[PDB]
């Protein structure tokens, strides 16, 4: 599924991602834009053989099982394919674990480089939330 901007904002808010670990909703929407262009089916292969999955490009090194990242963990205890569903519950629940792990949203490269230090509120501007 390719979410609309406000549609995704509403879903993320409903799932309690807004202000989670102190990160306002616009941060998450911005991150999703640049990680996946709001596409739940986004995947990207990393140099090391792991793969990033879903609207927040969660990696199989640590967070999900895809059966093709030897020696990896599955800390969210899900198949990586669960992160590709039209329903963002699994991605959101896993993202909460990630952003709690010490590094905050710096875990998302695209967030650090394209969202951090910017007007992130712009990403939820115009939405009825
Ligand atoms: C809770 C998360 O931290 C889990 N973690 C996510 C990624 N971490 C991020 C970082 O550690 O800030 C980077 C790699 N991490 C370095 C380290 O832990 O020393 C080694 C593996 N860790 C071991 C552990 O964490 O128990 C498992 C996966
Ligand atoms: C995998 C280990 O890293 C687990 N870790 C014990 C060993 N770390 C060493 C270091 O962080 O490489 C001690 C310093 N650590 C700083 C930091 O993580 O913020 C304290 C908090 N951590 C929380 C977590 O790691 O996320 C406690 C569990
Ligand atoms: Cl929308
Ligand atoms: Cl914030
Ligand atoms: Cl915001
Ligand atoms: Cl894909
Ligand atoms: Cl992989
Ligand atoms: Cl994701
Ligand atoms: Cl694997
Ligand atoms: Cl393969
Ligand atoms: Cl699995
Ligand atoms: Cl959803
Ligand atoms: Cl933080
Ligand atoms: Gd770690
Ligand atoms: Na914070
Ligand atoms: Na894995
Ligand atoms: Na498997
Ligand atoms: Na699993
Ligand atoms: Na999901």
Swiss-Prot record:
Which GO terms are recorded in the biological process aspect for this UniProt protein?
cell wall macromolecule catabolic process; defense response to bacterium; defense response to Gram-negative bacterium; defense response to Gram-positive bacterium; killing of cells of another organism
Where would I find the C-type lysozyme domain in this sequence?
A: 1-129
Enzyme Commission identifier(s): 3.2.1.17
Q: In which tissues is it expressed?
A: In the egg white and polymorphonuclear leukocytes.
Q: Which cysteines share a disulfide bond?
A: 6-127, 30-115, 64-80, 76-94
Which InterPro entries did the record assign? Glyco_hydro_22 (IPR001916), Glyco_hydro_22_CS (IPR019799), Glyco_hydro_22_lys (IPR000974), Lysozyme-like_dom_sf (IPR023346)
Q: Does the keyword Hydrolase apply?
A: yes
Task: Give the matching SMART domains.
Answer: LYZ1 (SM00263)
Q: What are the annotated GO cellular component locations? A: cytoplasm; endoplasmic reticulum; extracellular space
What is any Pfam family matched here? Lys
> In which compartments does the protein localize?
Secreted
> Which CDD domains did the record assign?
LYZ_C
Q: Which GO terms describe its molecular function?
A: beta-N-acetylglucosaminidase activity; identical protein binding; lysozyme activity
Entry keyword set: Allergen, Antimicrobial, Bacteriolytic enzyme, Disulfide bond, Glycosidase, Hydrolase, Secreted, Signal
Enumerate the active-site residues. 35, 52
Q: Which reaction does it catalyse?
A: Hydrolysis of (1->4)-beta-linkages between N-acetylmuramic acid and N-acetyl-D-glucosamine residues in a peptidoglycan and between N-acetyl-D-glucosamine residues in chitodextrins
Main EC class the enzyme belongs to: hydrolase
Has keyword Plastid?
no
Record-annotated residues binding substrate? 101
**Further details from the record:** Lysozyme C is capable of both hydrolysis and transglycosylation; it also shows a slight esterase activity. It acts rapidly on both peptide-substituted and unsubstituted peptidoglycan, and slowly on chitin oligosaccharides.
Task performed by this protein: Lysozymes have primarily a bacteriolytic function; those in tissues and body fluids are associated with the monocyte-macrophage system and enhance the activity of immunoagents. Has bacteriolytic activity against M.luteus.
Assembly, in brief, is: Monomer.
What family, per the record?
Answer: Belongs to the glycosyl hydrolase 22 family.
Q: What is this protein called?
A: Lysozyme C
Lineage summary? Eukaryota, Metazoa, Chordata, Craniata, Vertebrata
């Amino acid at each position: 599924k390719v979410f609309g901007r406000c549609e995704l904002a509403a879903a993320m808010k409903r799932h309690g991602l807004d202000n989670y670990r102190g990160y306002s909703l616009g941060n998450w929407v911005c991150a999703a834009k640049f990680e996946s262009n709001f596409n739940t089916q986004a995947t990207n292969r990393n140099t090391d053989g792991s793969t990033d999955y879903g609207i927040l490009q969660i990696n199989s090194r640590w967070w999900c099982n895809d059966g093709r990242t030897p020696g990896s963990r599955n800390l969210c205890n899900i198949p990586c394919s669960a992160l590709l569903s039209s329903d963002i519950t699994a991605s959101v629940n896993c993202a909460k674990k990630i952003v709690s792990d010490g590094n905050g949203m710096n875990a998302w490269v695209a967030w650090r480089n394209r969202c951090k230090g910017t007007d992130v509120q712009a990403w939820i501007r115009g939405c009825r939330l």
